[PDB]
Amino acid sequence: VVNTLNTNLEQSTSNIKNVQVKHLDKVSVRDLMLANALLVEKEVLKALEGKF
Amino acid sequence: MRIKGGKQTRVRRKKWLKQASGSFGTRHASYKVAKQTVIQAAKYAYRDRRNKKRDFRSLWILRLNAALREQGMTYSVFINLLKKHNIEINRKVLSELAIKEPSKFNLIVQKVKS
Amino acid sequence: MKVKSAAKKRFKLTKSGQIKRKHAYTSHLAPHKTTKQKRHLRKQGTVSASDFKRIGNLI
Amino acid sequence: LNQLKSVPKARNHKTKTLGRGHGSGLGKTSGRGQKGQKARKSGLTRPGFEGGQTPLYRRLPKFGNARKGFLKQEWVVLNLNKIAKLKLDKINRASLIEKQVISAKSQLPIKLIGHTKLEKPLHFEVHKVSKQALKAVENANGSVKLLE
RNA sequence: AAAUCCAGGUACGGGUGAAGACACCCGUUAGGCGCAACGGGACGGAAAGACCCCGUGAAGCUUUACUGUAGCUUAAUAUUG
RNA sequence: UUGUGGUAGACGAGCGUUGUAUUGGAGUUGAAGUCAAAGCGUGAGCAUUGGUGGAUCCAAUACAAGUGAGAAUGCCGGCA
RNA sequence: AGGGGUGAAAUUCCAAUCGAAAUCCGUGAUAGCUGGUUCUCGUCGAAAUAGCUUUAAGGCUAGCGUGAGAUCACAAAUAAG
RNA sequence: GUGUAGUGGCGAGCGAAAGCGGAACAGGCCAAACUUAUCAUUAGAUAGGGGUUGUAGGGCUUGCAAUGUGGACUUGAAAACGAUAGAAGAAGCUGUUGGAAAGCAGCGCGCAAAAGGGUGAUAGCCCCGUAUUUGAAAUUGUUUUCAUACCUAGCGAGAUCCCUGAGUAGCUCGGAAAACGUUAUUUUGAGUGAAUCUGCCCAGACCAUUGGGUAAGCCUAAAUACUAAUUAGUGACCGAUAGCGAAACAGUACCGUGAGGGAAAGGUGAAAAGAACCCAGAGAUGGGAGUGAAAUAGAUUCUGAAACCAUAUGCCUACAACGUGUCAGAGCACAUUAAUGUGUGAUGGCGUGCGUUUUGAAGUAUGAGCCGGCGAGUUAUGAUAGCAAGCGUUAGUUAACCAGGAGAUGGGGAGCUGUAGCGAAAGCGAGUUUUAAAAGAGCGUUUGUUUGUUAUUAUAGACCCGAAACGGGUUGAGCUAGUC
Ligand SMILES: [Mg+2]
Ligand SMILES: [Mg+2]
Ligand SMILES: [Mg+2]
Ligand SMILES: [Mg+2]
Ligand SMILES: [Mg+2]
């Protein structure tokens, strides 16, 4: 999960069928409770706390 | 979405047909007749599972009457001679089987003479 | 589901159910009835609970 | 929460399938009875119908609509039994827009109403005040201005 | 080839029965299986009874039944002095 | 302790099918389907072995339905 | 050439069909009327009456079934007085 | 907004216009006054200038400021981005079962490519592609830039000057569009018929006051509806009784004079290596051989149930009344999903099928010859009720629409329900209607909302099948009737 949507990252992991990168506003309940492992970037916490 | 399902129908009909084997003619071939005959057979099973204990008691009565009639008294008098005097709960079959192993039965029929 | 037009013009609906209605026998023949009957029928009244089902879904 | 096993608490109720045999009940007749008009396709005649007998609505006389062709002039209303729970002084449209009870795009006149006593003073700016509502507001050593 | 056909190993008398029975009840008679015949029965087969009745069913026809109308005729007005 | 016949009919709990989703997993050392067998269940239904067959499929929890056939002088095909 | 035709008149004939042809379309016409309506187990269990009905083979409401909830004592039953 | 105001044999039913939130947004030009040139100028006509309307405008007399935006738009030039063929386009070997391994297993490897298809069985690395980066002589599309025409520009002063769409607006008779079953408004087949800015029309018959707008002439992109077609692709869509009627030479064959009606059926194997040769036979064909993993894959060609027809071990049956089975039970013959076992069953007791509809059917009442397949309470949009969940006492809640992976969702408060009722209504207000009555009675003096799921219900064919028929368009006088 990313806030600024970096392009080096999503250039990778696109050929990987397992994994996927998403901007914060594009994670759903299913897309998140399916993760089973995730990597949050340190920024989005400030955003997330605001959204509750 | 479309569902055909020819497996389940054939399996069910196969069970019904397998129930009726040893049936005359087409009764074991066509399913429509096999189901009728299985239903009817189970009705007869339910009725006979009661009629047979209705009838076996009668048979025991008959083969006890015959045994007592060769000693000098009747079955309709023997039952008194079990209940009122020498109160016995000997069953109505075993007093029958005791003739097939006799001379232990004569002990009964002369015991109640007291 | 359109409200029956010839009903919404005869059954005003009050608070908490209790459909309201006017009484019949008040339009035509005065002398054949009595004064007691006439002033009993002027006052409006509720609908019997038997017809409440037929009318509530009719509105 | 393990989509491989996702469960509710209770919402999956007895689905009355009407035409799939007798063991489930609701079978060949399917609950439609035996051989009536309702049994056939599209029974259930017109909602208000007593079958020839003049129906209740036809039997009863019609309510009269005096002010014909008009619409009742709506009022925005400020009852006193609840407005105490609302914390505000100097009541008017300019603040009722802020407290969201009224809307800015609403050129609608304001009425005041209600008998219940209120503790603190409130200064209302409204179009109509009841006699005893005005009395109640003034006993709280407040005021009411009646806009014209 | 055909129409027919719930499965059939498909007797008779008296009685009973949704009221006239191959099967039910109580008696009676009868080895298994064909072939040529004949038609009593299986309320045989072919036809969702043509008669009768019912449906707020159809169509055709009638008339001083109702409502309308093509036509025929009469008057005002325009064409027009 | 009191009960447990039952059409119309109300109510409850359930089996099976087809597919989607994620989770486990079996398969040319032979998958489904198909027949056969002297199994297991309170029922819908479910396994085990073998012959055939020659590539997909099974279980658990949800979800969605062209979802469950003995009758319609039913339709189509076959056969008496 | 069909709410027409033709008729030495019979309701004749109009492509094996004619009290108003044939096929296509509105059209999946409508049918209070027949027939059919597909898996299981458990719990409970009726009516076939009254009133009205251009209604009487149908319909509405009451009566009788079931499910959810309250009334739990003065309500409802069963015996004696 | 609302299923509202209304309209309706006030029955069935029908159903707006405002207002509000939004997608998109542009408004231009003639006729006539006046003037010009010419028509035997009897013009009342032809071609120009000029001018376009409402806080009224324009023309007529007189001045100031203007050189410019602007497009509903003409020709050229240049450029960009596309459409129509295509080019490059990374990475693997070993072992076992095996007919063939690409599986399984060992050790690696590449990635802006683990979308897809084929390759003897399931491949990221065998191939063809894909991601990516690219490229057009010729034809074509959209946009942009520069020049290029035609159209287009503003603030004042004077005064009874003139113009401002005639068989027109109205009025009457018959009808209709509009939500309205004829009614303001709008249209018209017949008849009549005005006025000219102190004007004309309008604000549900009508008049006055107030206020709004200027008909009777023309033109107009955008948002909107639809997709047989071209290209790329998708599917909790069908998978040969399905799905288009049609997977194949299907609107074919076939029926009918004609309009018109109108089908069924596909799969060898990885590859023909399509089965040379031999025996029987006239021959098809069959049986060996041969190829092949298998010929029980053989051209009848994937699998190959059932009804159905034949063969056979085991048991029973030729004095026996039978809805054909069941409960007992001998003898006989075998031996299992190891079980108080299996197949048959001389002989005793007992025994009038299944659905349907009916007061009641074994029924001399009806449906089904048998097997297999197909086949009948769903869906959209709203109403009420039950259950569960979120949110809550000035609460709850979004619709359209916009951005988005043909997504959850974010924005979007316009509206919806509830928060005060009563009354026919103005109105009053925890009270209110009736009433002289402040008595009495009626009704009220708080228990929400949005979704999920289920039952019932409404409008749509609304469980399925079933008419005789009704109306509209066409095709038929090659038989038959008449006439020529
Ligand atoms: Mg029926
Ligand atoms: Mg006959
Ligand atoms: Mg007015
Ligand atoms: Mg049935
Ligand atoms: Mg008959």
UniProtKB/Swiss-Prot annotation, chain A:
It comes from the Bacteria. Part of the 50S ribosomal subunit. One of the primary rRNA binding proteins, this protein initially binds near the 5'-end of the 23S rRNA. It is important during the early stages of 50S assembly. It makes multiple contacts with different domains of the 23S rRNA in the assembled 50S subunit and ribosome. Belongs to the universal ribosomal protein uL4 family. This is Large ribosomal subunit protein uL4.
UniProtKB/Swiss-Prot annotation, chain B:
It holds the Pfam family Ribosomal_L20. Keywords: Ribonucleoprotein, Ribosomal protein, RNA-binding, rRNA-binding. GO terms for cellular component: ribonucleoprotein complex; ribosome. GO terms for molecular function: rRNA binding; structural constituent of ribosome. InterPro entries: Ribosomal_bL20 (IPR005813), RIBOSOMAL_L20_CS (IPR049946), Ribosomal_protein_bL20_C (IPR035566). GO terms for biological process: ribosomal large subunit assembly; translation. NCBIfam families: rplT_bact (TIGR01032). Binds directly to 23S ribosomal RNA and is necessary for the in vitro assembly process of the 50S ribosomal subunit. It is not involved in the protein synthesizing functions of that subunit. This is Large ribosomal subunit protein bL20. The gene is rplT.
Swiss-Prot record, chain C:
GO terms for biological process: translation. Disulfide bonds: none annotated. Residues 1-22, 30-49 are annotated as: Disordered. Pfam families: Ribosomal_L35p. One of its GO terms (molecular function) is structural constituent of ribosome. SUPFAM superfamilies: L35p-like (SSF143034). Residues 30-43 have a biased composition (Basic residues). The keyword Membrane does not apply. GO terms for cellular component: cytosolic large ribosomal subunit. PROSITE patterns: RIBOSOMAL_L35. Transmembrane segments: none annotated. Keywords: Ribonucleoprotein, Ribosomal protein. NCBIfam families: rpmI_bact. Belongs to the bacterial ribosomal protein bL35 family. HAMAP family: Ribosomal_bL35 (MF_00514). This is Large ribosomal subunit protein bL35. The gene is rpmI.
Swiss-Prot record, chain D:
One of its GO terms (cellular component) is cytosolic large ribosomal subunit. The keyword Ribosomal protein applies. InterPro entries: Ribosomal_uL15, Ribosomal_uL15/eL18, Ribosomal_uL15/eL18_sf, Ribosomal_uL15_bac-type. Keywords: Ribonucleoprotein, Ribosomal protein, RNA-binding, rRNA-binding. Residues 20-34 have a biased composition (Gly residues). The keyword rRNA-binding applies. GO terms for molecular function: rRNA binding; structural constituent of ribosome. Residues 1-56 are annotated as: Disordered. Residues 8-19 have a biased composition (Basic residues). Pfam families: Ribosomal_L27A. Part of the 50S ribosomal subunit. Belongs to the universal ribosomal protein uL15 family. Binds to the 23S rRNA. This is Large ribosomal subunit protein uL15. It comes from Mycoplasma pneumoniae (strain ATCC 29342 / M129 / Subtype 1) (Mycoplasmoides pneumoniae).
